[PDB]
Design a protein around this ligand. Sequence first.
Ligand code: JHZ
Ligand code: SAH
Ligand code: ZN
Length: 404
Amino acid sequence: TACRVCGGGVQEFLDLGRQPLSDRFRKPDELDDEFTYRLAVGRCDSCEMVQLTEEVPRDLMFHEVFPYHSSGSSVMREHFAMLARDFLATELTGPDPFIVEIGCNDGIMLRTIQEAGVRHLGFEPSSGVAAKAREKGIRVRTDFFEKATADDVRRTEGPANVIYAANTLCHIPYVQSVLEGVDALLAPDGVFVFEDPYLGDIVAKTSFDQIYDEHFFLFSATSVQGMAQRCGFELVDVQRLPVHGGEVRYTLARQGSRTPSAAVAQLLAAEREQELSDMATLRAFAGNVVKIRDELTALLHRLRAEGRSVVGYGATAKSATVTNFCGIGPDLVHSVYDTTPDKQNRLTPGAHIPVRPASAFSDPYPDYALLFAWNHAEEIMAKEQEFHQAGGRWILYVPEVHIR
Ligand SMILES: Cc1cn([C@H]2C[C@H](O)[C@@H](COP(=O)(O)OP(=O)(O)O[C@@H]3C[C@](C)(N)C(=O)[C@@H](C)O3)O2)c(=O)[nH]c1=O
Ligand SMILES: Nc1ncnc2c1ncn2[C@@H]1O[C@H](CSCC[C@H](N)C(=O)O)[C@@H](O)[C@H]1O
Ligand SMILES: [Zn+2]
């Protein structure tokens, strides 16, 4: 397998087996045929980039029925509004500033830009969520960001002061074409800013459910610094974020155009000191993955033997990896509750557990809820105090299998 960043050799450390598309939710009547692929992860020999060993073609994941609605979380709505206000106070202060977002989804970040009257453009090749952004008055192009479409936007709209991508850069194997696009489009003094699940968090929390079709790369500061450098950019800031199980926001500028924050060198030194991307650490993570599988299925089977009911909460893309690697289906977890209309009255991929509206998670409550949306624990548990007061308990499997 050749590294998608630098062409070095990729060495596998974890094999999650055959997996379905994480975001495809079938009607119960649909034939049980699904596209599958081998999900496994390795680390490049030369640049330390951790990445999957099989690419799922983009069109199979992102398209008119891609289901994820960013705005379905109040935490994430606030998180992106604040980001947007931060950009409007700093990088977008010129005359006629321009910001491009890669992956704007339903307009969770760009609405704030639009409301500020700032010129902007979102790339959103999944047309269903693209439409929701256009309804809020956001300018959206229903296309993938890549070298050529970036060219097209530079030609017609001029340079962007800011190009931003959240939970999207790590989804793109063709990151070199994206970087070529960023080079063509970004102002000489602008910044390309992206935030994605952080390898450090994944390793410390054993959060293997962060590994699935749409997550091609598990970025670290070490590997991003390398990938930037090789394309003529430089990692000039890093910021850790608690969202989505733990992320880093990376800020790239043209090389030497700005001085790197002390936070960059410090995070690098921490990564180096903790041997984050050494093959041995990544293998130890893989070993911990198997322990979590074993403990979780032992728990679920015990619950069933003791006549306790178990449902799941959150029909996450992440959960596809849990249910398929661990072999958890409707016999162990009878339903999954979720707020996304187009995931309701469907079956989860691979495991085929029925998905029901969260409004259906109500008295009489099940004994246990397996919390797939564990990155949303605070927000969800706050809305579900009655469940816990009634005696229902949460099953978590990050960072360890435990009930509370
Ligand atoms: C907050 C809340 C959520 N829910 C439901 C809504 C969603 O279906 C799901 C959470 O999905 P959530 O962890 O945010 O992303 P997922 O892992 O799917 O990941 C998806 C896919 C993708 C692009 N690859 C990615 O990285 C992220 C950004 O999004 O859980 C409730 O029911 N009640 C609630 O109160
Ligand atoms: N090459 C590309 N350019 C632009 N958007 C892309 C892309 N490849 C995938 N996407 C979009 O990336 C999005 C990832 S979902 C993340 C959305 C949002 N920024 C958030 O953080 O919540 C999906 O809507 C998907 O269609
Ligand atoms: Zn590499």
